[PDB]
């Protein structure tokens, strides 16, 4: 056949085309492989936290949450209730950040450019929530083993309410442009069909499973933090194609607003990190007056806290699918091994199967529907 080299995240496709049809798709990854998993072995558990902001750099605080849940599990400590509600609050804001990127850059790739600009004026307002809690628009490093770094600034919850009060209308404007559009439907309907059994055997997760009717979501089957105290519905597809997965992501954005409306009303008072100075650093006003607090501030920031020896696989329902870390501890301050299970790694491996009997222009649609970011695929 004809062998082409498409590409310049950055990807390289070695495709074999019989005219307009795709005969085999051979993704070449590692263009953004950086040795994150090897570098983490030279860092303390706190120093390794910013590495997870940079794996899936559209869902920063969900990557932080998964790592914190893993370290908290090996530590055998529990974050306080207010911190958990904050993590769910910003986990769902992070879901909106990712789904806007997934839906709108997917639409941009297939020629629909306008919705990208509308919804990136809402991302620019959600980046202000990130910046007001952590000081960084994207790589907050706000979620940490033990809870969150700082408490919410006064007035932030009023601004989260004003934003969420108008976001439903913005999703409707998006749907008015895509959902019933015949050109958009022709590019997504019956494209990249995945059967339920193939989806499971190929290791898919997230909307890839749910687009094909599989009723699975870790926020409901294996809840973490306070997701079992929030009411929301899990969208389920029927055809298993790109269009059904597109609707699942758009409906999930509406359910995040539903959850966010509850984290604002049910936010409890209290502290925002575990009241255990051998894990979480003391307050600065007590590190400067108490001898115990100064010793623990000194040790937590130089040596770090020791994690009991053990190995855990901890996973969360990240916006892109099941995100998990297999974290191995040897009893010291530094992880012995940290395998990062990126949901897009298994999805991309299934591009060759999902692209059988499709045109070259459907590969763009298929890659968009898998919601692939090569920071987490390559690591």
């Amino acid at each position: 056949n004809l062998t082409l080299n498409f590409g310049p995240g950055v990807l390289r496709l070695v495709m074999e085309l019989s005219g307009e049809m795709v005969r085999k798709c051979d993704p070449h990854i590692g263009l953004l492989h950086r040795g994150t998993e090897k570098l983490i072995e030279y860092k303390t558990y706190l120093q390794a936290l910013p590495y997870f902001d940079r794996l899936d750099y559209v869902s920063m605080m969900c990557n932080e949450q998964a790592y914190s849940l893993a370290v908290e599990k090996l530590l055998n400590i529990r974050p306080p209730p207010r911190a958990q509600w904050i993590r769910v609050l910003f986990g769902e804001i992070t879901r909106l950040l990712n789904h806007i990127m997934a839906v709108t850059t997917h639409a941009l790739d297939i020629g629909a450019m306008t919705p990208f600009f509308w919804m990136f004026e809402e991302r620019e307002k959600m980046f202000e929530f990130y910046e007001r809690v952590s000081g960084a628009r994207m790589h907050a490093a706000y979620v940490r083993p033990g809870g969150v770094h700082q408490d919410l600034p006064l007035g932030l919850m009023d601004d989260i309410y004003e934003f969420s009060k108008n976001f439903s209308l913005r999703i409707d404007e998006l749907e008015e442009m895509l959902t019933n559009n015949r050109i958009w439907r022709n590019r997504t309907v019956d494209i990249g069909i995945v059967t339920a059994e193939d989806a499971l055997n190929y290791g898919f997760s997230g909307v890839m499973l749910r687009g094909s009717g599989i009723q699975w979501d870790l926020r409901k089957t294996q809840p973490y933090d306070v997701y079992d105290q929030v009411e929301f519905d899990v969208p389920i597809g029927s055809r298993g194609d790109c269009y059904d997965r597109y609707l699942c992501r758009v409906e999930e954005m509406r359910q995040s607003i539903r959850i966010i409306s509850q984290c604002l009303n049910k936010m409890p008072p209290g502290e925002i990190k575990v009241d255990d100075a051998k894990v979480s650093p003391p307050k600065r006003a007590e590190m400067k007056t108490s001898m115990e607090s100064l010793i623990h501030h000194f040790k937590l920031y130089t040596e770090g806290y020791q994690v009991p020896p053990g190995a855990t696989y901890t996973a969360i329902e990240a916006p892109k699918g099941e995100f998990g870390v297999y974290l191995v501890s040897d009893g010291s301050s530094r992880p012995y091994r940290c395998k990062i299970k990126a949901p897009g790694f298994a999805h991309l491996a299934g591009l060759d199967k999902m692209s059988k009997g499709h045109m070259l222009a459907d590969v763009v649609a298929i890659i968009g529907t898998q919601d692939i970011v090569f920071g987490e695929v390559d690591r």
């Binding site: 082409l4 297939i110 509308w118 022709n186 045109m359 070259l360 222009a361």
Partner: protein, 318 residues
């Protein structure tokens, strides 16, 4: 005085094309909640001039293994034909008053497909030859419906003279009797000019390069002028064809103002559509032409051949 007339046509066209790039970036800007160029000159008015100077003082890269003769011929053919199609247009008085003006427009339009073909050949790339073949197949497919649609409308006008379409619409726009034909004509002029949602080559950026991806600097600018000169001309053709303006021989400037407004709005409709829709897959825009547009165009050609005869409304030959 005739050589003055030619320049009074060519130069304003190249200025209209220049400031269509500004309007496209500002109409798309505001439809996307932003402003577009407003820094280079007041309200961006100097932006086309900066882009023009920039392009013509940049390296005009030509790959060493490219056929030089065809690499140079293609932009000359494209722009030369782009300006040629403007000479018979009755705005309200043609520069060259042709008896077969409509057929001249079709004849020159079908020659412009060569520039796409020659440019693809000259690249010696094969990342652009496939693009050229895809682009050429699209263009020739959609000039089948342009000819048959245009033939159907001329059966209510009587002749191929472009000025006779003014007389035909002296009582009513041809869009009412022929709105089914006008709809497909508008889409067919979008696909001929490779405008969204039919831009599989120019800016698809979906594992498909454009036939002029290898052009840079001035030669790229010339292709751009030809492409944008055709967008205005096709929309001016649509205004004359379906939105005829009344012509007062004593105040001909009244026609030009009204006809200029309609052409601008139709041109701004091209910009409106690019901001609103995704793009057809290549095999879908062929099915649009061969399976949807062509069957309907043929039926409406049969209907418009027999409608004048059965209503005793055959137009005069002169």
């Amino acid at each position: 005085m005739f050589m003055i007339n030619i320049l009074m046509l060519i130069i304003p066209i190249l200025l209209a094309v220049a400031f269509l790039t500004l309007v496209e970036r500002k109409v798309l800007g505001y439809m996307q909640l932003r402003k577009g160029p407003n820094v280079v000159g007041p309200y961006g008015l100097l932006q086309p001039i900066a882009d023009a100077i920039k392009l013509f003082i940049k390296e005009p890269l030509r790959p060493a293994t490219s056929s030089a003769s065809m690499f140079i011929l293609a932009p000359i053919m494209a722009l030369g034909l782009a300006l040629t199609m403007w000479i018979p247009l009755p705005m309200p008085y043609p520069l060259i008053n042709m008896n077969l003006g409509v057929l001249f427009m079709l004849a020159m339009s079908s020659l412009a497909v060569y520039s796409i073909l020659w440019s693809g050949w000259a690249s010696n790339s094969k990342y652009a030859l496939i693009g050229a073949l895809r682009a050429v197949a699209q263009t020739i497919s959609y000039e089948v419906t342009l000819a048959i649609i245009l033939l159907s409308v001329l059966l209510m006008s009587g002749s191929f003279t472009l000025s006779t379409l003014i007389t035909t619409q002296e009582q009513m726009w041809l869009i009412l009797p022929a709105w089914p034909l006008a709809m497909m004509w508008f889409i067919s002029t979008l696909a001929e000019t490779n405008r969204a949602p039919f831009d599989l080559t120019e800016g698809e950026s979906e594992l498909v390069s454009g036939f002029n991806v290898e052009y840079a600097a001035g030669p790229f600018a010339l292709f751009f002028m030809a492409e944008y000169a055709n967008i205005i001309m096709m929309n001016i053709f649509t205004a004359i064809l379906f939105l005829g303006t009344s012509h007062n021989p004593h105040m001909p400037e009244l026609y030009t103002i009204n006809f200029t407004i309609k052409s601008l709005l139709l041109t701004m409709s091209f910009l409106w559509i690019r901001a609103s829709y995704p793009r057809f897959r290549y095999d879908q825009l062929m099915h649009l032409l061969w399976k949807n547009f062509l069957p309907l165009t043929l039926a409406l050609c049969m209907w418009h051949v027999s409608l004048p005869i059965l209503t005793s409304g055959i137009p005069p030959q002169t």
